[PDB]
Design a protein around this ligand. Structure first.
Ligand SMILES: COc1cc2nc(NC3CCN(Cc4ccc(C(N)=O)cc4)CC3)nc(Oc3c(C)cc(C#N)cc3C)c2cc1OC
Ligand SMILES: [Mg+2]
Lengths: 556, 414
């Protein structure tokens, strides 16, 4: 007998004020009972479970299931009630590595620690809660009761305690062998390195000689896979990586189950397939809750679907990360809030791709969206590579310089360079800082009755030019914007506009180039045609000449 | 330090479950080096999966320093930790701290590592050193001693801190000392000639009674901190646009000051005139401008600091490296106004300027009232949360909210 190092137990407690489960055992058939007694007899002699007496008041129902071809029954303890009463744990398996950040590792050996999963002991002060009773034949004898001595399959804390216990054991080995990387996931250990295979297996056998010191039989995986590894929906080759075959069906009646199908596949493919759109397909996802109704396809969504089909014809592959080279990310505008980017180190070979969707709002511009896309790529790059990449942006240095110096908010973009890839982000209009000399001054105002929704809007100018337009089905805020549009429509290339609308100022000072309101979009189109525009604000109902004259004409 | 102080949370509140935000490789390696030494010194210990709590952590570099510092975001833990009245029912803030001349700010945070923490509270200080690309599980730790940036650290050490400060309080009676979190504010009414030697008298005085960042003292001068009252332009020729901006400023000031009138200043804009046309001031309108000018010379009546209500800090970007700010508890009742200029190390980075501005305003708010205000930042949420940690240099972190609508008050504070 060779001494083994004991695995340190994790102290587990129930939730405060809660007790263990006390669920009645299901009446099982005679064939299931004989199967459960035979397997629990083997699990007991292996030290996984142990018999108990009638003192334990807790109980958990145990079931017996059978597969298709395998003529073998298997137990299944339903710890659903115990998991509700067990404390919360720290899950160390929430995130998944992205292949674009994983470097080259030629030698690879995948081990199976399945027999080590049931070797980690459970806290002895908590084993009494894992009680389960196997019903007796014809209910004529007391049911045989066991309790788990190791981490049970299906328990809340089993995955986290196992990985924590495995990480604690692998720490000295992963520290004294820096040329070896070990990835933990489920009952599998993914070991890789860049050394020749002769040195790899020897260190693999060293890992097998390290885990046996805790008594963990860890051999090679049965039926080792081919070079293209199928790992979390990816195809992992030695020098390249890609996603498993994802092809969209050709249908004519799409329902809601196909709603999470196209979006799920296109978003999962945007990480390697460039230029992928899904917004026109996602706009049909506003208020559909059930999973059976049909939605007719718009030709804007069909054209978008056909554009992605041409990209999904030939498979695109990505390269692995090289820390010796720089990290570069280039962004392109696709239209209507659509943005796509490519991340690479050497040209014509991307590490990964992606897309950014415009944050929905009333008003926006391309500079905000590009800025938001940069912050999204920045955070994603810190996750995968731990560093901010150099950006290639389709915006002039002068355009960005004018933007951030005059924008009312604070804004910043990390180190970037301009790339001439149309369409380019440009400032469509810039308001003046001071009043314009020689330009006609338009005093505008608007008003509307809150009951009948009848309103007026217009302007008065220093040259005697006037206009008042009656409006139907409008509001006070809408007449204030209408008066601005009228002043821009009837003025020359240079114009000074005087308004008292704080609502209209907040929209224009936000500098939008596109909005969901047709009236604001008409104002923007008017601003682009101008050469100089100065917008000035005055307090209303304060005897300001020109402002009160136009106020009484719209107030009826 | 042997006996622990029983620390509890607020009734019906669990510990913090805040997710660790991604960190660069240079910050991860720096925190691993720092936490490895702290683990050898017994300040922190590894924890298992039975501890589900977490508090974010990141690495900074102090002002005029070349060594990384471990900074913890105990904001969620501090608001869940109970109010510390275990000794004093509440210390009124020293009003003389803001009337002194030269105030030095030290970092007595390392002195907190000599006092152990209640074993029943150590699990709530859990933090995670994240891994890159989810390669390995994050390194999990918890504090065995009083951590820097925790609300209870200066309150628990307040019993031992005073015993070290008594031999110096007896030496100088007219010197004001104030402690907030990991900072000790030392102010004196004498010039900087002996101020360096007087603070140096306090540096090794703390070490011999028990430090990486205890050698530097952030100097302040609150006696010369300028305020920004409402000022009206003095012009010899007024255009229509100038008068329009004047009445708009006086109408805004009318909500703060009573008696402000704009009637005589409106009768000059009579008619539909061009913005660039000069309007001569009548003597009746000049009297109204003089009356309003004298009203603004006086401070706001009916203003007061209520220690029960929170402080609010608004910031407006004025351009050319100029940032104006206001501190208040009630709208239009400003407790202090100010203006910064020429942010060092940030000429093409508004984020770094705004970040440093938040630190300076919070520092001023500590000296005056002894607490931090909630900020209204003129910046998108995604841009601020991505870069503010890169320029942060203080041991404390205030609360902040984001302003998405351009304020019209910017034109008047300019
Ligand atoms: C710096 O830390 C790490 C770096 C890692 N690098 C990598 N890089 C990988 C290495 C494998 N190759 C395919 C291949 C390459 C040649 C061959 C061959 N010639 O037989 C077969 C397959 C793809 C790229 N894999 C890590 O963990 C793995 C992950 C996350 C998934 C799988 C799978 N299934 C396997 C492993 C080993 C890393 C873990 C690290 O830390 C924990
Ligand atoms: Mg009006």
């Amino acid at each position: 007998m060779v001494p083994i190092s004991p695995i340190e137990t994790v102290p587990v407690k129930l939730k405060p004020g809660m007790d263990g489960p006390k669920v009645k055992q299901w009446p099982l058939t005679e064939e299931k009972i004989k199967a459960l007694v035979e397997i629990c007899t083997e699990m007991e002699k292996e030290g996984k479970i142990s018999k108990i007496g009638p003192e334990n008041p807790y109980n958990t129902p145990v079931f017996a299931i059978k597969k298709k071809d395998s003529t073998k029954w298997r137990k299944l303890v339903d710890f659903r009630e115990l998991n509700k009463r067990t404390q919360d744990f720290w899950e160390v398996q929430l995130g998944i590595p992205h292949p674009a950040g994983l470097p080259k590792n030629k030698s690879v050996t995948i081990l199976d620690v399945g027999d080590a999963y049931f070797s980690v002991p459970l806290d002895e002060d908590f084993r009494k809660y894992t009680a389960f009773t196997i019903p007796s034949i014809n209910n004529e004898t007391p049911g045989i009761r066991y309790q788990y001595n190791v981490l049970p399959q299906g328990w809340k804390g089993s995955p986290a305690i196992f990985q924590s216990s495995m990480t604690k054991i692998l720490e000295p080995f992963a520290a004294q062998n820096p040329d070896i990387v070990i990835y933990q996931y489920m009952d599998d250990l993914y070991v890789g390195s860049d050394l020749e295979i002769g040195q790899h297996r020897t260190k693999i056998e060293e890992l097998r000689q390290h885990l046996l010191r805790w008594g963990l039989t860890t051999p090679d995986k049965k039926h080792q896979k081919e070079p293209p590894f199928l790992w979390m929906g990816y195809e992992l080759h030695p020098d390249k990586w890609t996603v498993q075959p994802i092809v969209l069906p050709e249908k004519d009646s799409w329902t809601v189950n196909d709603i999470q199908k196209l979006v799920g596949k296109l978003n999962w493919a945007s990480q390697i397939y460039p230029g992928i759109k899904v917004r026109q397909l996602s706009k049909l996802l506003r208020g559909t809750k059930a999973l059976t109704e049909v939605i007719p396809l718009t030709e804007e969504a069909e054209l978008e679907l056909a554009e992605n089909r041409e990209i999904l014809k030939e498979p695109v592959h990505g390269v692995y990360y090289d820390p010796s080279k720089d990290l570069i990310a280039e962004i392109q505008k696709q239209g209507q809030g659509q943005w796509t980017y490519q991340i690479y180190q050497e040209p014509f070979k991307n590490l990964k791709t992606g897309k950014y969707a415009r944050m929905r709002g009333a008003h926006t511009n391309d500079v905000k969206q590009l800025t938001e896309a940069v912050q999204k790529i920045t955070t994603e790059s810190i996750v995968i590579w731990g560093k901010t990449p150099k950006f290639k942006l389709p915006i002039q240095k002068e355009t960005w310089e004018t933007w951030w110096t005059e924008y009312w908010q604070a804004t910043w973009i990390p180190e970037w360079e301009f790339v001439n890839t149309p369409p380019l982000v440009k400032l469509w209009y810039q308001l003046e800082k001071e009043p314009i000399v020689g330009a006609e001054t338009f005093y505008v105002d608007g008003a509307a009755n809150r009951e009948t929704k009848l309103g007026k809007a217009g302007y008065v100018t220093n040259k005697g030019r006037q206009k008042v337009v009656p409006l139907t089905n409008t509001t006070n805020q809408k007449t204030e914007l209408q008066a601005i549009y009228l002043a821009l429509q009837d003025s020359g290339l240079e114009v000074n506009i005087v308004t008292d609308s704080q609502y209209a100022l907040g929209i224009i000072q936000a500098q939008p180039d596109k909005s969901e309101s047709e009236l604001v979009n008409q104002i923007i189109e008017q601003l682009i045609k101008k050469e100089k525009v100065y917008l000035a604000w005055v307090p209303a109902h304060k005897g300001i000449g020109g402002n009160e004259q136009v106020d009484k004409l719209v107030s009826a | 330090p042997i006996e622990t102080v029983p620390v509890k949370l607020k009734p019906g509140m669990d510990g913090p479950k805040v997710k660790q935000w991604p960190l660069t490789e240079e910050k991860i390696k720096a925190l691993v080096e720092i936490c490895t030494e702290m683990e050898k010194e017994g300040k922190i210990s590894k924890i298992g999966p039975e501890n589900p709590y977490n508090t974010p952590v990141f690495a900074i570099k102090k002002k005029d320093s070349t060594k990384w510092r471990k900074l913890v975001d105990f904001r969620e833990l501090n608001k869940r930790t109970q109010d510390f009245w275990e000794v004093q029912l509440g210390i009124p803030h020293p009003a003389g701290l803001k009337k002194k001349k030269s105030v030095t700010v030290l970092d007595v945070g390392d002195a907190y590592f000599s006092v152990p923490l209640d074993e029943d509270f150590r699990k709530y200080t859990a933090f995670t050193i994240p891994s890159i690309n989810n390669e390995t599980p994050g390194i999990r730790y918890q504090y065995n001693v009083l951590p820097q940036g925790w609300k209870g650290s200066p309150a628990i050490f307040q019993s031992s801190m005073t015993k070290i400060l008594e031999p110096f309080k007896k030496q100088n009676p007219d010197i004001v000392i104030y402690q907030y979190m990991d900072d000790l504010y030392v102010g004196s009414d004498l010039e900087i000639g002996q101020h360096r030697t007087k603070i140096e008298e306090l540096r090794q005085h703390l070490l011999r009674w028990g430090p990486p960042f205890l050698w530097m003292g952030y100097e302040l001068h609150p006696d010369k901190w300028t305020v920004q009252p409402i000022v009206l332009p003095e012009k010899d020729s007024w255009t229509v646009n100038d008068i329009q901006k004047l009445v708009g400023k006086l109408n805004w000031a009318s909500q703060i000051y009573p008696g402000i009138k704009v009637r005589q200043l409106s009768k000059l804009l009579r008619g539909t005139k061009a913005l660039t046309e000069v309007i001569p001031l009548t003597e009746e309108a000049e009297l109204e401008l003089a009356e309003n000018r004298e009203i603004l010379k006086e401070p706001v009546h009916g203003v007061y600091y209520d220690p029960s209500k929170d402080l609010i800090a608004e910031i407006q970007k004025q351009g050319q490296g100029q940032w104006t700010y206001q501190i208040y508890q009630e709208p239009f009742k400003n407790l202090k106004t100010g203006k910064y200029a020429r942010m060092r190390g940030a000429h093409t980075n508004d984020v770094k300027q705004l970040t440093e501005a938040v630190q300076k305003i919070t520092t001023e708010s500590i000296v005056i009232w002894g607490k931090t205000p909630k900020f209204k930042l003129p910046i998108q949420k995604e841009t601020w949360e991505t870069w503010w940690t890169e320029y942060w240099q203080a041991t404390w972190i205030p609360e902040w909210e984001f302003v998405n609508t351009p304020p019209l008050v910017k034109l008047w504070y300019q």
